Amino acid sequence: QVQLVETGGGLVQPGGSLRLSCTASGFTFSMHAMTWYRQAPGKQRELVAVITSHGDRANYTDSVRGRFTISRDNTKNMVYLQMNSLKPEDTAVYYCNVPRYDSWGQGTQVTVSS
């Protein structure tokens, strides 16, 4: 079965930084586009970033552009989300997703607060 496991969340100050990881198994990861989504309380889930199978090109939602970077390691079968210059508005559960199947992990929590 497709399995995605996210980690790396935490509580950080405004302006701070976290690195999220997604460990993928159960599918030919190297040949799949991957995504990160997030869902904040009282809001719908939203796509944060998408990355090509090779890892060379990415698209971002407007609110995170220039601050977040999606990347991947196809040897380790991992996707990463580097979250820099964090803001309270970024507080949410962040989910790794395989768009081919709309597969989701259980998520990791990011809280940005003073």
Side-chain angles (χ1 to χ4, degrees):
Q1 184 161 12
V2 172
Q3 184 180 300
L4 304 173
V5 180
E6 306 93 336
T7 189
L11 288 101
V12 292
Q13 296 285 315
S17 179
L18 292 166
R19 183 204 58 183
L20 307 189
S21 303
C22 172
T23 301
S25 60
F27 62 107
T28 309
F29 180 86
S30 294
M31 295 179 149
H32 288 243
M34 292 297 291
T35 64
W36 283 92
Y37 283 75
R38 69 187 175 180
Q39 184 171 8
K43 293 171 63 174
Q44 289 262 26
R45 195 165 300 191
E46 79 173 325
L47 189 276
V48 172
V50 52
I51 189 169
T52 57
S53 60
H54 287 98
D56 57 330
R57 307 193 189 270
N59 299 120
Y60 296 91
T61 193
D62 200 26
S63 62
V64 311
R65 202 177 291 103
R67 297 189 302 113
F68 297 3
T69 305
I70 187 169
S71 66
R72 68 194 292 157
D73 184 326
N74 286 343
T75 295
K76 297 178 183 295
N77 280 12
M78 292 174 68
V79 200
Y80 304 97
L81 189 68
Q82 186 64 33
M83 306 171 73
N84 289 348
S85 291
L86 277 162
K87 302 177 179 179
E89 59 190 75
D90 295 317
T91 295
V93 179
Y94 284 72
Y95 298 97
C96 183
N97 164 289
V98 184
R100 172 179 176 181
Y101 304 119
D102 199 45
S103 304
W104 302 91
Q106 286 150 340
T108 185
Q109 173 80 48
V110 169
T111 315
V112 184
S113 179
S114 304

